[PDB]
């Protein structure tokens, strides 16, 4: 068990809070203390979830989901399933106040989209401006819907909390600068969490592994600021049964799930026939052998930066199966029919290339290059983007 697997947060003031990490508690909190605190649970990457969200983040097993059709007993059984995971987890962590705090504020009525009216979706701080939230809970503090923007957790597991404001000591300064001054003050092993509108405190490095500059975007936004990229390598985790392609950033995988069987196979040089690597120009994906061959210097730099062994570039089998278009959407590329209607010269769109004979080369190239070189899209690509 991790010594920082929970943090207990308490209100001590107008817009003032204090936290204590599990390992720093000087006493064994009673069930009342547990139930009166905002309880933050550490997930597998060091994000911290308040209770109603930690509970729903328990996922249902594939088999159980399938076996379940019903409905509403559907909700009942999902809840009973998560309730036992939740209860057993609280027992092991030694927590005796196990309230979930999912109860909604029943004085608040939704708009026709079943969402909060704009007048009901803000909390007002005394000194720091307003903050937008996702949901109105009957127990707002305990549900996590009242925390500050920033949680710092030092190498000693001490918690410091912070609010941004328009024109503060970091106005128009970058998250990375705040970050450097934090690790100078506290130690370079210090963790920084940035609050989501939901109440989740996402670790700053988790956010950057999701999209470079996300941590900074979230940081700026707290102060009312606004400021202005394919993954380096990707692995196909789809094509199953055969199922659709789904290419997941290698960096994401290796940073965030260092003991995944995908991650560990990749580290040993396996699954190289499912790996795509970005050209020096940023516009094209190709196999690792193709890149090794066509640009050995960039190959060696990309593979060291991303954490893959250079042996992948001396491998080859004896490409028509691959999707005609892939689309970047976070740290993964998706086939067009996998994106929701709201998701869909986009610089996020990559086309399965074809040579002068009409045959698939295996590469994917950005649509912007098709426009710049005045190259017509292949017809398979062209109809998916219609």
């Amino acid at each position: 068990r991790r010594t920082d697997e929970y943090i207990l947060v308490r209100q001590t003031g107008q817009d003032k809070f204090a936290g204590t990490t599990k390992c720093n508690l000087d006493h064994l909190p009673t069930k009342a203390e547990f139930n009166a605190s905002c309880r933050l649970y550490r997930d597998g990457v060091g994000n911290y979830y308040p209770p109603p969200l930690a509970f729903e983040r328990i996922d249902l097993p594939e088999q159980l989901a399938a076996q379940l059709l019903e409905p509403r007993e559907q909700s009942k059984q999902c809840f009973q399933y998560k309730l036992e995971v939740w209860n057993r987890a609280h027992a092991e962590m030694g927590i005796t106040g196990t309230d979930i705090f999912y109860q909604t504020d029943k004085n608040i009525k939704l708009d026709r989209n079943y969402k909060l009216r704009p007048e009901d979706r803000y909390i007002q701080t005394e000194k720091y401006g307003r903050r937008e939230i996702q949901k109105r809970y009957e127990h707002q503090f305990q549900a996590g819907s009242l925390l500050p923007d920033i949680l710092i957790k030092t190498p000693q597991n001490d918690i410091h909390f912070s609010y941004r404001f328009a024109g503060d000591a970091y106005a128009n300064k970058r998250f990375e600068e705040f970050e450097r001054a934090i690790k100078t003050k506290y130690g370079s092993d210090t963790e920084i969490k940035l609050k989501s509108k939901s109440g989740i405190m996402h670790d700053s490095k988790y956010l950057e592994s999701w999209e470079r500059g996300s941590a900074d975007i979230r940081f700026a936004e707290f102060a009312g600021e606004n400021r202005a990229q394919f993954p380096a390598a990707t692995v196909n985790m789809g094509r199953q049964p055969m199922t659709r392609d789904r290419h997941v950033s290698v960096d994401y995988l290796l940073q965030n799930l260092p003991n995944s069987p995908w991650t560990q196979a990749l580290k040993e040089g396996k699954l190289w026939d499912r790996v795509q690597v970005l050209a020096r120009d940023g516009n094209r994906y190709m196999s690792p052998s193709r890149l090794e061959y066509s640009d050995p210097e960039h190959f060696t730099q990309l593979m060291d930066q991303v954490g893959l062994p250079v042996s992948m570039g001396r491998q080859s089998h004896a490409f028509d199966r691959q999707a005609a278009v892939i689309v970047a959407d976070g740290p993964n590329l998706r086939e067009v029919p996998d994106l929701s209607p709201e998701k869909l010269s986009q610089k996020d769109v990559l086309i399965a290339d074809r040579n002068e004979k009409g045959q698939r080369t295996g590469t994917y190239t950005n649509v912007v290059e098709y426009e710049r070189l005045m190259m017509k899209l292949p017809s398979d690509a062209a109809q998916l983007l219609a």
Partner: peptide, 28 residues
């Protein structure tokens, strides 16, 4: 939608990928 409506659209995409990637079987 009370199981998911306390989450941001982005928090749900994050979770979806984490779950996908935690439960994905190696190829044969």
């Amino acid at each position: 939608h009370h199981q998911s409506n306390g989450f941001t659209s982005l928090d749900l995409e994050m979770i979806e990928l984490e779950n996908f990637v935690l439960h994905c079987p190696l190829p044969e």
